[PDB]
Amino acid sequence: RPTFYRQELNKTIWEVPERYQNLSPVGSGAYGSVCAAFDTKTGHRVAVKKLSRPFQSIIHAKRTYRELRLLKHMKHENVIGLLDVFTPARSLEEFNDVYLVTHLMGADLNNIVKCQKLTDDHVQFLIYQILRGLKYIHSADIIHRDLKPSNLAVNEDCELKILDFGLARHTDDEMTGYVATRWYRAPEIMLNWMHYNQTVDIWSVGCIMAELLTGRTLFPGTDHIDQLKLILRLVGTPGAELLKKISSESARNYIQSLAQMPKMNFANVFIGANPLAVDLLEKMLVLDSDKRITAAQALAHAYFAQYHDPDDEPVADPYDQSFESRDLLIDEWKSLTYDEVISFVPPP
């Protein structure tokens, strides 16, 4: 057991192992409080997150377990990993506080591309890395659900990691009106058409790749309905085959009220883009999610010829998510979380 020290940071008590020095607040949210620190054990600059009210309800205690299980599992170059997890408690009886440690991230994709377009070579490398990370995530039957530029960290060498997985239901208010939180969402999840699956992430990659090529948001809708009209104008109104797969009767009736439109010519929309970039966008931005290209298929597309290496695109160890259908008490989720904290093995 390391020695812990206490200090108060912006009306918040922090009790952390001595290895973590020079803590300074970086962010605050509903989820918790975040400090930058220097890790004397590894020489890395790190983010330390103190979870807020981790065991306040069953909903909160289950979210805390979900987040720790997910971060402990993810071991890939293009995905955020867990450097450390600690509690000051010396027993389950006094356990209340959970702290998560990850590599400090300097810039997100917005910081390299806010109101700006990039070279084709930069777009190839950046989208290759997202898909390498998604092949790994999807091989464990994990759906990210919230891919957008602010959830992608990038360094001065254009190296990229995926972070901030979807682990809480987003609030109704958070998805309302002119907001980046909805611009990257697949239509089937934005409007609750049907049970969604991992193909929602590929729709988000199509929206990010379009915005790197043009320097403009692809579908910046002022609300859910405006955003759907922008989508259907590019990819066309749905045929009978997709209309059948929409479980909601009222969602089906609403779509049928719209005048029919054909799919546009993507070479006339993405003027001057590499023809291989236009071809891959037509394969991602498909309205019927059954027909979209998968991350494993996209890695073999000619657009990535200079980066693709089928001996260095690894898959994940199996991930058990059976806990998600388990009905447990607060103290039972808390005990499961405690065991996961004490069994943590640091990376080499």
Ligand SMILES: NCc1ccccc1Oc1ccccc1
């Ligand atoms: N949002 C402006 C934009 C800029 C560049 C390329 C596409 C684009 O969005 C479109 C274009 C055509 C139909 C639907 C969306």
Ligand SMILES: [Cl-]
């Ligand atoms: Cl220490």
Ligand SMILES: [Cl-]
């Ligand atoms: Cl990492």
Ligand SMILES: [Cl-]
């Ligand atoms: Cl504690």
Ligand SMILES: [Cl-]
């Ligand atoms: Cl964003």
Ligand SMILES: [Cl-]
């Ligand atoms: Cl597992």
Ligand SMILES: [Mg+2]
């Ligand atoms: Mg985020």
